[PDB]
Amino acid sequence: DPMVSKGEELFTGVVPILVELDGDVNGHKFSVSGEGEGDATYGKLTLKFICTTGKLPVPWPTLVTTFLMCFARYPDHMKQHDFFKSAMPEGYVQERTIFFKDDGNYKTRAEVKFEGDTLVNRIELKGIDFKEDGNILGHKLEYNYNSHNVYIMADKQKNGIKVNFKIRHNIEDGSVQLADHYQQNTPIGDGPVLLPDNHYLSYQSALSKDPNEKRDHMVLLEFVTAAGIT
């Protein structure tokens, strides 16, 4: 497959990653820079993010999903279903609304593309209607993360895909803050892209801190593998 060759050929080894985020949640403004690397052969990504503006006004876990689906390991038997790589190097736009249950919402727009040998994720995030002293603005979410399936389907009208999944963030009191994700991706370029059959990505994420780092930051380790087409 000479197509599942091109976009796909850009991901066969370790790819450097840059992420840049401009954010405004209820007027609380902030910027984040992130760097790391992805190895799609194993579905592995290792990233570190720094709040460059000072204190992050929302919990780091709330931003995990916003901060690289092109790095999913697609089994050989499902390589025709890999939209994210097929859109490279010109890349794709990933838009979301994230509905925090009984709280506000984030709306994000990201461009994911190559700049030279580096895969870049440039994001604008706007959050509105949050509670002051709620789980998000009041920082009540634990610094951890659960494993979740992400469900993918074709959106033939936008020549892209739609994605839907729920994240439950563990709250400090033992309960959970649901974050309902609605997502759309569309290619930036005009070239052919794969429109997949319904399938899912299995995600696991691990959050940590760099013991030498005094800025507000997050270290993220993620494993992601496509499935659900036997």
Cα–Cα distance between 126 and 101 in angstroms, integer? 17
- Report how many domains make up the chain: 1
Method: X-ray
Resolution in A: 1.6
Which residue type is seen at 50? I
Give the structural domain span for 184: 1-230
CATH number (domain holding residue 76): 2.40.155.10
